Design a protein around this motif. Structure first.
Motif, PDB file in Angstrom:
ATOM      1  N   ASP A 184       0.843  -1.220   0.000  1.00  0.00           N
ATOM      2  CA  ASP A 184       0.000   0.000   0.000  1.00  0.00           C
ATOM      3  C   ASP A 184       0.868   1.255   0.000  1.00  0.00           C
ATOM      4  O   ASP A 184       0.292   2.361   0.025  1.00  0.00           O
ATOM      5  CB  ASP A 184      -0.987  -0.030   1.183  1.00  0.00           C
ATOM      6  N   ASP A 186       2.576   2.731   2.303  1.00  0.00           N
ATOM      7  CA  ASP A 186       2.522   3.598   3.502  1.00  0.00           C
ATOM      8  C   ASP A 186       3.826   3.576   4.298  1.00  0.00           C
ATOM      9  O   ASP A 186       3.901   4.236   5.348  1.00  0.00           O
ATOM     10  CB  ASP A 186       1.311   3.263   4.379  1.00  0.00           C
ATOM     11  N   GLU A 193       2.982  -4.943   9.161  1.00  0.00           N
ATOM     12  CA  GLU A 193       1.601  -4.473   9.463  1.00  0.00           C
ATOM     13  C   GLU A 193       0.756  -5.655   9.968  1.00  0.00           C
ATOM     14  O   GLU A 193      -0.059  -5.458  10.900  1.00  0.00           O
ATOM     15  CB  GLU A 193       0.949  -3.809   8.265  1.00  0.00           C
ATOM     16  N   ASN A 222      -3.637  -2.491   8.422  1.00  0.00           N
ATOM     17  CA  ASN A 222      -4.073  -3.191   7.190  1.00  0.00           C
ATOM     18  C   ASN A 222      -2.950  -3.085   6.172  1.00  0.00           C
ATOM     19  O   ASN A 222      -2.672  -1.995   5.738  1.00  0.00           O
ATOM     20  CB  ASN A 222      -5.330  -2.533   6.617  1.00  0.00           C
ATOM     21  N   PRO A 223      -2.310  -4.182   5.737  1.00  0.00           N
ATOM     22  CA  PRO A 223      -1.226  -4.068   4.739  1.00  0.00           C
ATOM     23  C   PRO A 223      -1.700  -3.614   3.352  1.00  0.00           C
ATOM     24  O   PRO A 223      -0.867  -3.279   2.480  1.00  0.00           O
ATOM     25  CB  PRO A 223      -0.668  -5.501   4.695  1.00  0.00           C
ATOM     26  N   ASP A 225      -4.044  -1.096   2.843  1.00  0.00           N
ATOM     27  CA  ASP A 225      -4.681   0.232   2.921  1.00  0.00           C
ATOM     28  C   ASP A 225      -3.771   1.190   3.692  1.00  0.00           C
ATOM     29  O   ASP A 225      -3.407   0.901   4.842  1.00  0.00           O
ATOM     30  CB  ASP A 225      -6.088   0.152   3.531  1.00  0.00           C
ATOM     31  N   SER A 226      -3.378   2.299   3.080  1.00  0.00           N
ATOM     32  CA  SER A 226      -2.528   3.313   3.736  1.00  0.00           C
ATOM     33  C   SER A 226      -3.297   4.029   4.852  1.00  0.00           C
ATOM     34  O   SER A 226      -2.627   4.619   5.697  1.00  0.00           O
ATOM     35  CB  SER A 226      -1.983   4.287   2.734  1.00  0.00           C
ATOM     36  N   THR A 228      -5.929   2.679   7.375  1.00  0.00           N
ATOM     37  CA  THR A 228      -6.703   1.515   7.861  1.00  0.00           C
ATOM     38  C   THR A 228      -8.103   1.948   8.337  1.00  0.00           C
ATOM     39  O   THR A 228      -9.060   1.243   8.045  1.00  0.00           O
ATOM     40  CB  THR A 228      -5.917   0.785   8.953  1.00  0.00           C
ATOM     41  N   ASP A 235      -1.452   5.192   8.198  1.00  0.00           N
ATOM     42  CA  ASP A 235      -1.097   4.268   9.299  1.00  0.00           C
ATOM     43  C   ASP A 235       0.245   4.695   9.892  1.00  0.00           C
ATOM     44  O   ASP A 235       0.403   4.643  11.107  1.00  0.00           O
ATOM     45  CB  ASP A 235      -1.046   2.825   8.794  1.00  0.00           C
TER      46      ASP A 235
HETATM   47 CA   LIG Z   1      -1.365   0.068   5.847  1.00  0.00          CA
END
Ligand SMILES: [Ca+2]
Ligand SMILES: [Ca+2]
Ligand SMILES: [Ca+2]
Length: 724
Positions: A184, A186, A193, A222-223, A225-226, A228, A235
């Protein structure tokens, strides 16, 4: 922790030669390409700070317009990419790059070593990036020439994600996820994550159980989603505390949203029959934060094998909706009771009951009585916009509220009530205050690390709601609303970390909630499931019952409300008890042959407390004939009960025969027939405290001899003001 700028680059330090096994990542410290050893040495033994590959990534700007070449201090093992172009390759193929003063361009530097090098080696301390001008005059690239990736920008996330899947030496995209992959973009690797990481002074490492004793927080996120929980901050910005520190400290966790919730309450509420407010009647007014979530709710009981219960509201509303209850009159109402119109005045107070800082807001508030609007506050009353920190008010607590007659919307006049409306207020029909916060802003960082306005809260509210569950805690003094990461268990590619309601209460109330002997307390009062009354919406009730009833799949070990796995848009309102009785703090009267038990609320006559291998409960005394256990409330034990209020009295009970549960309050007494149960089950009986009719006793009246009755965990929770 340190408040740090976004200067230097972001350094990734790998154990292996191939940028696959990340050990730690950090911004680079002033005019070096390394990190803060005082902090790093606490996260990782110095002996494990040895690396075979390094990536530095972010942005470069020149302090002077010119045409430059670049080199690393050790150039034959370095490759430099600038603005997506390879500009130096192991000291060869140097491109001249034109840089305009103050214009940031992407930079990625990769370095490979033939054997591991400890960060404390001469060579590691010596690493620098050099700029060579048109004269072949050499300059070290300065800290102010370098910036970290602009974490919240999609182009920066794409740059980080791409860098995690390939390197400039072998130019072969990774086929699968490894301990460097950052899907993602992030900054935090997917496996960190999922499995855990911590960050201190912006140094990030993989979680190790040795970090627990040192008091570090284990983050998961959440790996895929930047953001979560969908809030304005990535994140990484949240876990690293690289955000407006006016946001509540619980938001420095990827699983707790920064989310303001502005409401309005009323204080010093008066009514007069006179427009000039002469001969005003005063009131024992009350603010009922969660009124629509509790008043008229249906109770669903006998849930699962542990037999818990909850309330269900058909009109569930979040914390921007408040009820104001008249409570009782103070003074002579003779005149007011004959009048054809009444005039209401009050002070108002804005409260931010969420976790997010809100700036430059001009809230709008409707005042609605029995579906009719009686007043509106518009932007006109706040020509000077408000800024309110989480858990704070405007005016601040300890300052008087704002008189309605002083606010520009009211034109120096009180609120007119028709005759019917005046009767409605005096009879405890609520004035509902609904507040909206659609111009308020949050703060972010721009590409040079400057604090700017990021946008309106309105612009992020959808994504926060879609990714979180709502928890409202109402203790009848203040309210707090939290939004915490939720997961759709039906969608396996939703890789949000699983969180229970209990886990969410602990994460989102770090100051007010503590766990003692496996049970949660809120400001030293019970907030464990058997002590509180929980209210749900219809959706959330259905979702809870599905999880309880699942005995074999994802939810096979969910048997209690606090064990429920949060799903998106779940809603919970928790009413904290105003009085409680636990058999763990009771003592028997009568020595060898107990006849009663003294607990926190009074003496249970014809009951005793029984210890079964540490598990305590009350049991009815069994002298050979039927008695009724009777709680004789002690003087003072019900001082926390509001006058002219309705409550639930709740307890867990087991009997082999039916019995009658009675709350004695004279003409306001209540009773319920309780069916026999094999196991403890929760029962909830309405109770009324009408001024002049104190609650005197609880009685468990049996039916049948012989039999047994056992009970525990008695709680009293507020509902709302009693209508006259
Ligand atoms: Ca993330
Ligand atoms: Ca990531
Ligand atoms: Ca279950």
């Amino acid at each position: 922790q340190k408040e740090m700028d976004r200067k230097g680059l972001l350094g990734y330090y790998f154990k292996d030669k191939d940028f696959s096994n990340l050990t730690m990542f950090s911004p680079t410290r002033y005019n070096t390409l390394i990190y803060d050893q005082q902090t790093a040495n606490k996260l990782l033994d110095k002996k494990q700070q040895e690396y075979q590959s390094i990536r530095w990534i972010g942005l470069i700007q020149s302090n002077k317009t010119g045409d430059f070449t670049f080199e690393l201090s050790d150039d034959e093992c370095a490759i430099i990419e600038m603005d997506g172009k390879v500009i130096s390759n192991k000291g060869k193929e140097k491109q001249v790059v034109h840089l305009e003063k103050g214009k940031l361009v992407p930079i990625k530097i990769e370095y490979q070593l033939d054997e591991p090098l400890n960060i404390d080696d001469e060579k590691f301390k010596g690493f620098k990036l050099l700029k060579v001008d048109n004269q072949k005059q050499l300059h070290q690239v300065q800290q102010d020439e370098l910036r970290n990736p602009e974490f919240n920008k999609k182009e920066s996330q794409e740059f980080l994600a791409k860098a995690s899947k390939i390197n400039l030496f072998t130019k072969k995209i990774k086929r699968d996820i490894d301990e460097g992959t950052d899907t993602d973009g992030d900054s935090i690797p997917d496996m960190w994550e999922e499995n855990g990481y911590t960050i201190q002074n912006r140094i990030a490492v993989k979680w190790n159980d040795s970090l627990a004793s040192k008091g570090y927080t284990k983050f998961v996120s959440n790996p895929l989603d930047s953001h979560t929980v969908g809030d304005p901050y990535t994140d990484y910005e949240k876990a690293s505390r690289d955000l407006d520190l006016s946001n509540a400290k619980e938001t420095f966790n990827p699983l707790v949203a920064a989310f303001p919730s502005v409401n309005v309450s009323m204080e010093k509420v008066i009514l007069s029959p006179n427009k000039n407010l002469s001969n005003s009647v005063e009131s024992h007014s009350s603010t009922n934060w969660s009124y629509t979530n509790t008043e008229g709710a249906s109770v669903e009981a006998g849930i699962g094998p542990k037999g818990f219960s909850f309330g269900v509201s058909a009109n569930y509303q979040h914390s921007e909706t408040v009820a104001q209850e008249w409570g009782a009159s103070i003074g002579d109402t003779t005149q007011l009771n004959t009048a054809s119109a009444g005039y209401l005045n009050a002070n108002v107070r804005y409260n931010n009951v969420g976790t997010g800082a809100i700036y430059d807001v001009k809230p709008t508030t409707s005042f609605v009585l029995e579906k009719n609007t009686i007043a509106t506050i518009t932007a006109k009353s706040n020509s000077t916009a408000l800024s309110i920190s989480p858990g704070e008010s405007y005016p601040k607590k300890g300052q008087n509220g704002i008189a309605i007659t002083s606010m520009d919307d009211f034109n120096s006049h009180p609120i007119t009530l028709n005759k019917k409306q005046l009767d409605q207020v005096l009879t405890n029909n609520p004035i509902m205050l609904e507040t909206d916060q659609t111009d308020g802003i949050y703060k972010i960082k721009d590409t040079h690390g400057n604090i700017v306005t990021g946008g309106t809260w309105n612009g992020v509210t959808q994504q926060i709601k879609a990714k979180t569950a709502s928890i409202i805690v109402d203790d009848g003094k203040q309210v707090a609303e939290k939004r915490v990461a939720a997961k759709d268990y039906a969608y396996p590619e939703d890789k949000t970390p699983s969180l229970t309601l209990k886990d969410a209460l602990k994460l989102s109330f770090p100051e007010e909630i503590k766990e003692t002997d496996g049970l949660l307390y809120y400001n030293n009062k019970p907030i464990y499931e058997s002590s509180v009354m929980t209210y749900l919406d219809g959706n959330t009730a259905k979702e809870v019952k599905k999880q309880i009833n699942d005995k074999t799949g994802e939810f096979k070990d969910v048997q209690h409300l606090y064990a429920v796995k949060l799903t998106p848009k779940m809603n919970f309102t928790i009413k904290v008890p105003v009085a409680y009785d636990t058999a763990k703090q009771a003592v028997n009267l009568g020595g060898d042959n107990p006849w009663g038990a003294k607990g926190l609320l009074g003496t249970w006559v014809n009951a005793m407390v029984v210890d079964n291998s540490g598990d305590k409960a009350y049991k009815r005394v069994e002298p050979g004939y039927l008695l009724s256990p009777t709680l004789e409330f002690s003087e003072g034990s019900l001082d926390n009960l509001k006058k002219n209020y309705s409550f639930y009295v709740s307890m867990y009970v087991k009997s082999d025969k039916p019995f009658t549960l009675r709350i004695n309050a004279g003409p306001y007494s209540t009773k319920r027939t309780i069916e026999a149960s094999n196991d403890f089950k929760r029962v909830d009986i309405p109770a009324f405290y009408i001024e002049g009719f104190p609650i005197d006793t609880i009685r468990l009246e049996g039916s049948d001899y012989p039999s047994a009755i056992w009970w525990k965990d008695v709680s009293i929770t507020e509902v709302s003001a009693v209508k006259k």
